[PDB]
Design goal:
Strand content of chain A: under 5%
Keywords (chains A, D): Acetylation, Congenital dyserythropoietic anemia, Disease variant, Glycation, Glycoprotein, Heme, Hereditary hemolytic anemia, Hypotensive agent, Iron, Metal-binding, Oxygen transport, Phosphoprotein, Pyruvate, S-nitrosylation, Transport, Vasoactive
CATH class of chain A: Mainly Alpha
Distance between the termini of chain A: 20 Å
Distance between the termini of chain B: 17 Å
Radius of gyration of chain A: 15 Å
Largest sheet of chain B: none
Structural class of chain B: mainly alpha
Shape of chain A: globular
CATH architecture of chain A: Orthogonal Bundle
Shape of chain B: globular
Number of strands of chain B: 0
Helix content of chain A: 55-70%
Structural class of chain A: mainly alpha
Largest interface: A-B, 22 and 22 residues
Function (chains A, D): Involved in oxygen transport from the lung to the various peripheral tissues. LVV-hemorphin-7 potentiates the activity of bradykinin, causing a decrease in blood pressure.
Protein name (chains A, D): Hemoglobin subunit beta
Helix content of chain B: 55-70%
Radius of gyration of chain B: 14 Å
GO biological process, one term (chains A, D): platelet aggregation
Bound molecules: protoporphyrin IX containing FE
CATH superfamily of chain B: Globins
Number of strands of chain A: 0
Oligomer: heterotetramer
GO molecular function (chains A, D): heme binding; hemoglobin alpha binding; hemoglobin binding; metal ion binding; oxygen binding; oxygen carrier activity
CATH architecture of chain B: Orthogonal Bundle
Number of domains of chain B: 1
């Protein structure tokens, strides 16, 4: 994660606004809804049958919240993402056995959510700025896969 | 496949897009090019700078191509048949590149339609664009 | 899509497979499981060890499923319609996982048919299996 | 690239047999034939219209040869693949602009070729052994993409 200093301000200024509470679940939920096969890892979360049930599910907003903690975390440790995500990697990898392709999708829905909430502020340069981050995070987690 | 529930969403989410259709088609592109650089290699003759009328024009073109698809969903393969050859044969576009533009097409819709881009409609479009991208890389399978 | 040239290859490359069809269906699986571990999470009730009769049996099942597809190519969606639900709905198999098994299905054919697996026929099958995997993850689009 | 010592012997013993001459082009060619969009990077190689023309093309056997040199190379430097492929990375990345997805496909056709030539010797354990390598190489090249 290189990130020109101007791409930094873009990512920085935008994030600090993010409703770190709601946004988390907004992503994870849409992941379960738009990419159904993901749901196979949260049967334990309760009813995930309709979208309305997934977006109202308390287990989802509670997990997405954490998931965003991992972002905010990595977002302030770009310099070294692998180490930051070393634990989570192993977990998602040799434990949960989640296909790394799914870490790109989640990151991609997150970028849709961020587009949904900041509409016009989320300009094309600010998107490509986050797009670097999402891949960056998405790769550190797929590390243990070597 | 597209359940009658999806095609209604798509059809309802797109009507709201209206005349802005062509503008969003040009915004998506800019997004793809800035976000995924490796896609700029297809557009060398294009001046991929911010105000680029070319990117504006092809944005309209891409827009209409999808419209054609919405208003002919229950038969996308026959409609975009042409485009398939053009992208699959002449242009030889790496299939991956369709998943990217499809992403930036939703990142553009979501930043323009905050009332309609609900999780359900979000999935409908993802499906729609997935089918649109299937058809185009059909002349590959 | 599948040009009449592909369906002939497929049909010609598969006939050569003959009664070994079910054995190769079990070999592919073993290959997927050893190569791509993250796929073993779908088969917990299975004894994925080397001689596993379960893996042998499902190998036959998968084999026949494709045969059904070869001998009904000009209409795969209707044939595997069932399987789609079963994988797309009940089992919820990550779509990626189809690209892997498709790989191991060719790695198995190529190590069994050295005379027919020519580059041309190699592409035909890749296309065939791509369509087979499209159909199954159709109840997704 | 971890590679248990027994997976090492598998990869080792098999490779040393490989017709490092013919095998190279056999892969690259099938890549151009089975994944047509790849051809967009070798227009300069001449006629790539039919498969017969791609497999007879002298430019292809000459390039695949090199491409295999890179493998044999990385195959004896697993310990550090990124460095080994640091140059090639930058080249394929910020120069040729080739989508990293294509480095998985090529590696995957290579594994088909290897299955084609050793038929039954190329057992399932030996495949998963190479499958690690192909991803390993496939990632070192996609490095410059961060
Ligand atoms: C950017 C990517 C992702 C981030 C940052 C992320 C982050 C996290 C964090 C913070 C935890 C929980 C640790 C704790 O409770 O202390 C976690 C757990 C888990 N993650 Fe992820 N995750 C990501 C992608 C995914 C994806 C794509 C899936 C798979 C479909 C997934 C499935 C899980 C599961 C099921 C657990 C649940 C643990 C429990 O039962 O409490 N995650 N993830
Ligand atoms: C969402 C799917 C896509 C649609 C709807 C779409 C539609 C079209 C249309 C309408 C044209 C112009 C036809 C004409 O007026 O002659 C076209 C041309 C072209 N498309 Fe796309 N396209 C899609 C994706 C892509 C992607 C993935 C790329 C590459 C990154 C791409 C590259 C091209 C190129 C290079 C041309 C020719 C440009 C020119 O010379 O003006 N398209 N496409
Ligand atoms: C090439 C595409 C595939 C075909 C042709 C295929 C075909 C089938 C068939 C025939 C059945 C058994 C139906 C029955 O007798 O009730 C089945 C079951 C199943 N498939 Fe597949 N399959 C495919 C890919 C996969 C993949 C990608 C996975 C997962 C990695 C998978 C996981 C399953 C599971 C878990 C079952 C149920 C197993 C059981 O309970 O016995 N299949 N599939
Ligand atoms: C395991 C993956 C790959 C390896 C090991 C590999 C290796 C190499 C090597 C050794 C060179 C040439 C350096 C020289 O001539 O001194 C090279 C050049 C190049 N590679 Fe790759 N490559 C890989 C994947 C790909 C893929 C997937 C593509 C893209 C479709 C590709 C396209 C190119 C091109 C076009 C050049 C040509 C340079 C020229 O014009 O002479 N390579 N590659």
């Amino acid at each position: 994660v290189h990130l020109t200093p101007e791409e930094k301000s873009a990512v920085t200024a935008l994030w600090g606004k993010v409703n770190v509470d709601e946004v988390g679940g907004e992503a994870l939920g849409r992941l379960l809804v738009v990419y159904p096969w993901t749901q196979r890892f949260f049967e334990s979360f309760g009813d995930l049958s309709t979208p309305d049930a997934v977006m109202g599910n308390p287990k989802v907003k509670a997990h997405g919240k954490k998931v965003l903690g991992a972002f905010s975390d990595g977002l302030a440790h770009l310099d070294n993402l692998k180490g930051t995500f070393a634990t989570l990697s192993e977990l998602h990898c040799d434990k949960l056995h989640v296909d790394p392709e799914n870490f790109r999708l989640l990151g991609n829905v997150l970028v849709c959510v961020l587009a949904h909430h900041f509409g016009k502020e989320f300009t094309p340069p600010v998107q490509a700025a986050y797009q670097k981050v999402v891949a960056g995070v998405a790769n550190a987690l797929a590390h243990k896969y070597h | 496949v597209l359940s009658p529930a999806d095609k209604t969403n798509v059809k309802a989410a797109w009507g709201k897009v209206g005349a802005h259709a062509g503008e969003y088609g040009a915004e998506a592109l800019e997004r793809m090019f800035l976000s995924f650089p490796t896609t700029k290699t297809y557009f060398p003759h294009f001046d991929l700078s911010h105000g680029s009328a070319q990117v504006k024009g092809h944005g309209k073109k891409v827009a209409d191509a999808l419209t054609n698809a919405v208003a002919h969903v229950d038969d996308m393969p026959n409609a975009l048949s042409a485009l398939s050859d053009l992208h699959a044969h002449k242009l030889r576009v790496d299939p991956v590149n369709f998943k990217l533009l499809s992403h930036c097409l939703l990142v553009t819709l979501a930043a323009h339609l905050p009332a309609e881009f609900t999780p359900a409609v979000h999935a409908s479009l993802d499906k729609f664009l997935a089918s649109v991208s299937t058809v185009l890389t059909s002349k590959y399978r």
